TrEMBL record:
CDD domains: beta_Kdo_transferase_KpsC_1 (cd16440)
Lineage: Bacteria, Pseudomonadati, Thermodesulfobacteriota, Thermodesulfobacteria, Thermodesulfobacteriales
Protein name (record): Capsular polysaccharide export system protein KpsC
Residues binding CMP, per UniProt: D161, K198, H200, S245, Q246, E250
Domain of life: Bacteria
Pfam families: Capsule_synth
One biological process term in Gene Ontology: polysaccharide transport
Sequence intervals crossing the membrane: none
Length: 321
């Protein structure tokens, strides 16, 4: 009893526990809704930058309590956010991975270490191979790219579109017009190539609007609105253009050349071609090291079969079946 406490985490939105019934399992603490004061609390938590989340941040500030930034894990589910609960959860008491304006737990892991062991790196190799072999991604919904869709050996590049309102854009040091710059930069650099734009799945299903999807591009540009498996789609390109999408890291995991126009969580470590700078990120990292911290250590996994705390391999085995 000396090594544990009964001090719960405060939240200011009932929507968190609604969308994540196993929230307390992820947090390893109890949750309480709208506490009137800090006494008895071990932290406050919020989801993204919605109104209620910013109120939680303010209370953390007021009360001098840690603020836990909660997000869906990098491996989330078989289905989009509105289809099922998340299979892993990111819980960041420092900042949040997509916010390049401050440190985050993930950035701290990458900068200063404390975790690189032969045993962990072996696990990372195993998990990375399984994800590549089984074409696993965040949502695991898309269909395969049929043979004949792409012309063999034809030069082509891929631009990744995102959802309007994505906080990772502006907190990744970019803005709405960065997507237009990314497009014309790709044109100028690849005069002989075909240009493909992949619309975000949430925009395909009509729940959100996109940046590039709303633009009027040259008729020769091929805008993809079919719901292809993203890692299957990526296999048909060598060079990827992205502002701040997680799909850029999925491309990096497949060894593609990733040109970043924002500063996402995986940029600034020496593995990407960066149009932005982040002086706070100093240590160079290999892909395996970046993957180990970002996918194995940083998220909190549940064993989908038991509802109890687990690891990345529990979710992988669940996604395969
Ligand atoms: N244009 C896009 C952007 C993202 N995605 C998928 O959605 C996930 C989340 O991407 P965002 O970071 O852009 O929301 C990606 O890791 C990828 O699996 C996609 O399939 N097509
Ligand atoms: Cl919230
Ligand atoms: Mg998203």
């Amino acid at each position: 009893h000396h090594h544990h406490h009964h001090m719960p985490v405060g939240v200011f939105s009932r929507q968190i526990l609604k969308n994540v019934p196993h929230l307390e399992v992820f947090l390893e603490d109890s949750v309480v809704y709208k506490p009137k004061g800090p006494e008895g609390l071990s932290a406050v938590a919020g989801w993204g930058y919605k109104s209620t989340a910013r109120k939680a941040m303010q209370k953390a500030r007021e009360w001098r309590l840690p603020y836990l930034a909660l997000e869906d894990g990098f491996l989330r589910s078989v289905g989009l956010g509105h289809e099922a609960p998340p299979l892993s959860l990111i819980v960041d008491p420092v900042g949040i991975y997509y916010d390049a304006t401050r440190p985050s737990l993930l950035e701290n892991l990458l900068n200063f270490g404390g975790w690189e062991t032969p045993e962990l790196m072996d696990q990372a190799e195993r998990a990375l191979k399984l994800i590549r072999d089984h074409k696993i991604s965040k949502y695991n919904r898309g269909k395969p790219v049929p043979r004949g869709y792409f012309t063999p050996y034809r030069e082509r590049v891929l631009l990744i579109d995102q959802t309007y309102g994505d906080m990772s854009v502006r907190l990744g040091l970019a803005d709405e017009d960065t997507f237009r710059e990314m497009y014309f930069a790709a044109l100028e650099e690849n005069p002989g190539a075909e240009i493909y734009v992949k619309v975000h799945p949430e925009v395909i299903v009509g729940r959100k609007k996109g940046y590039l999807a709303r633009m009027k591009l040259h008729r020769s540009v091929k805008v993809i609105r079919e719901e292809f498996n993203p890692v299957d789609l990526l296999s048909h390109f060598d060079r990827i253009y992205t502002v701040s999408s997680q799909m850029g890291f999925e491309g990096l995991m497949l060894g593609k050349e990733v040109i970043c126009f924002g500063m996402p969580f995986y940029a600034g470590w020496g593995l990407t071609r960066d149009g932005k700078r982040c002086e706070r990120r100093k240590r160079r990292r290999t892909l395996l090291e970046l993957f180990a911290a970002a996918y194995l250590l940083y998220p909190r996994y549940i064993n989908p079969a038991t509802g109890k705390p687990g690891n990345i391999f529990d979710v992988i085995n669940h996604l395969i079946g």
